[PDB]
Amino acid sequence: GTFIELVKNMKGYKELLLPMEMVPLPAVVLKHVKLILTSQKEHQPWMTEMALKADQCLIHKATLDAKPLIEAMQQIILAMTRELWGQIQRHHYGIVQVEHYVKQITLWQDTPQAFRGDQPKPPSFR
Amino acid sequence: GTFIELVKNMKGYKELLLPMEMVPLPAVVLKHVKLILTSQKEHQPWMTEMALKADQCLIHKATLDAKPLIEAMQQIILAMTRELWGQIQRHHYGIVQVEHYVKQITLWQDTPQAFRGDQPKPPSFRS
Amino acid sequence: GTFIELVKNMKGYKELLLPMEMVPLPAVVLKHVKLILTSQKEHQPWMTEMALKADQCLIHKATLDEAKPLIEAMQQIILAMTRELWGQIQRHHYGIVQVEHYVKQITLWQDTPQAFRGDQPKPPSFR
Amino acid sequence: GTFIELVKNMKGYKELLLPMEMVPLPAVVLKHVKLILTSQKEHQPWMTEMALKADQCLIHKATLDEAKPLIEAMQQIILAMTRELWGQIQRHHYGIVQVEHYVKQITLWQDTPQAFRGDQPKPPSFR
Amino acid sequence: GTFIELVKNMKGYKELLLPMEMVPLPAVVLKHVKLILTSQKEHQPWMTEMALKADQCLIHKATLDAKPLIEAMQQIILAMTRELWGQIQRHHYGIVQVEHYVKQITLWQDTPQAFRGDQPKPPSFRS
Amino acid sequence: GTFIELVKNMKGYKELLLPMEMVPLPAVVLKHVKLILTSQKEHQPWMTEMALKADQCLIHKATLDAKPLIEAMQQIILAMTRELWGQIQRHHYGIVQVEHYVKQITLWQDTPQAFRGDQPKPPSFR
């Protein structure tokens, strides 16, 4: 995964992916995909990326129907699901709000529990 | 493939992926990713998207190092390269030029081989 | 800390050391050093000193990762550096006045008996 | 020095490290720390960081004053700190531009063969 | 090759050297050097650089007139011609045009042979 | 080496290479290459020439690990080192200053020792 490491060291880079624990489960994340694609018109390039991304999860899920080999796919599904959910948040809240929101989550989850305070408020559907 | 099928059944859709017979090998495609990512400044959102797909492809290749599982994964890798390779040409030529170039190949490929003629050349690089 | 004693009498002096229990583990502290450096667009002399200070911790981690007195001595140096590094991160993220003002409230809040503490003080907003 | 690599590409960056042979022994370096602090009348944030940095050396001196790898490791940390402390002393006494400008002349002067070096470069005036 | 590797890992880098499979033979390349150098006026700094490389290549060829030594030198000569030949095209076509022409060959060469198509032509000569 | 002779007979040509004796030793000359390339940004065409030139010396140096054949490489290393050092001087002092400085060196080194006087002052880092 050296490719992402190079980007993470670049100038003006802000992470847009939530921690694995905070990411929803599969399937339920896919439900939001239909609520966006089916409810959208005037196709745009980003809509194809999500479709070409969501369908990969289904193929991996269908593969459930070597165990170390199988374990790799399960991690991949979570990785793709984490990436896929980021676009869903990017679509609802835009891009700027997600940048600030993700930054606060890290601080609240990094400081010791004795001084965290309260979980930061997620952004609004503006 | 239902999700991609829905997108194709839309208005304003423009396919940007070349036929599988023209995409380079996975190793070659990853080579261009490093050159583009390494020689870039002022990180842009699309750069992260390209990197994430490259990371996913690497994991599958490492996993290769159960026949339905093995055979199915190979198809995913080929699809991943096609999606990633088509995104590279957007950076080199441009999305507008890619549409015509992909469209030209389709008519050229669909035309009978007897009178097919010379293959059209790729567009000019983005300035 | 004889040098520190030479700074207490100075007019504009402040105690730039958060409680030892407040700071997280060294690994997490270094993680936020990259984010502040990566996010920053321009350059100031302070970040260069910050970058060098963090680098020393990694060598100490690698170096640490009859000898008990020295092995224990290395840990104390690493922890002390983390507090100083963690102080800069907090002050930059929130502000010098807010951190010092916040520290006094929480420091007194813990001292007050639990039967009358009430609620914990206001955590500074990221601004 | 991965963090340092993140600062080289920055526009306003300079190499703030004099040659190891140029700096004196640690004891002499700490001696001039008091003079700059004692002479100074007002307070700025930089001296507070300088005071803390010097204090760490004294603990290392006391701490240093199968164990060979760690004992040798402590010496390297002390020497590296002295260069950074010695750099600040020189820049403050003479100036940032003069020190960097002077370093290049002397660095090249030594490289030139003795048969054609001539005379040593100009030592910066105390101003 | 560390030094060249460092340059490739920079921003604004543009490779100007063709693949070794396309460079002419060393004798042919030296032929163009004489024509350019002989038919020139108002000596320019780049002219000296081209001449010096040509002189170095000649010495190696004369030296040919120990297998690791002999084999290693032949690789140097081929590299020398590639570096020298790439510099000739800068004078004929131009640096800007060379970048695209070299870039076009890379995509053309990387594209699968089945659908590779006609080889792109060189740019127009500098006026 | 007839190629350089043709250039040396051209109009408006000024030598920028110091005598062999005044040129530093190898390796130490290479140290300045790193201090320039590693400290440089916004790659420029000349930076590639130095890299493609310095690396040749390393290959020749590695060859140390037929003696008339070997002697040829040693002379080549000095020749390349002399050429490589000229670029280093050209980078620090520019081009105009080096032209004048090299000219004075020749006069001081050509006149008899009874009338040389003092070695000319090398230029400054302007």
Author numbering:
A (entry chain 1B), F (entry chain UB): 0, 2 to 65, 75 to 135
B (entry chain 1A), E (entry chain UA): 0, 2 to 65, 75 to 136
C (entry chain 1C), D (entry chain tC): 0, 2 to 65, 74 to 135
Quoted passage from the original study:
We report the capsid structure of the African cichlid nackednavirus (ACNDV), determined by cryo-EM at 3.7 Å resolution. The sequence identity with HBV is 24% and both the ACNDV capsid protein fold and the capsid architecture are very similar to those of the Hepadnaviridae and HBV in particular. The capsid is made up of 90 protein dimers to give T = 3 symmetry, with three molecules located within the asymmetric unit: chains A, B, and C. In both HBV and ACNDV, two Cp monomers associate into stable dimers via two central helices, the resulting four-helix bundles generate outward pointing spikes, and the N-termini up to the beginning of helix α3 are wrapped around the spike helices; helix α5 together with subsequent residues forms a hand-like region providing the essential inter-dimer contacts.
We used cryo-EM density maps of the pH 7.5 and 5.5 samples to build atomic-resolution structures of ACNDV capsids. At the N-terminus, the ACNDV Cp sequence starts with a small α-helix (α+), which points towards the capsid exterior surface. However, the very first residues are not visible in the cryo-EM density map. The α2-helix is wrapped around the spike helices of the partner molecule in the dimer and the spikes are made up of a four-helix bundle within the dimer helices α3 and α4 in each monomer. Comparison of the AB dimer, formed by the quasi-equivalent conformation of chains A and B, with the CC dimer, reveals that the four-helix bundles forming the spikes match well when superimposing AB with CC dimers, while the hand regions appear to be shifted. This rigid body like conformational shift between the quasi-equivalent capsid subunits observed in the cryo-EM structure agrees with the solid-state NMR measurements, which show few local conformational changes, as is further elucidated below. Secondary structure elements derived by NMR and obtained from the cryo-EM structure of ACNDV Cp at pH 7.5 agree well. Residues 66-74 were omitted in the structure because the cryo-EM map density was not well resolved at the tip of the spike for pH 7.5 and 5.5 capsids, yet the connection between the spike helices was visible in local resolution filtered maps. Unassigned cryo-EM map density located below the spikes of AB dimers but not below CC dimers was found in the ACNDV capsid maps. Likely sources of the diffuse density below AB dimers are enclosed nucleotides and/or the flexible CTD of the capsid protein.
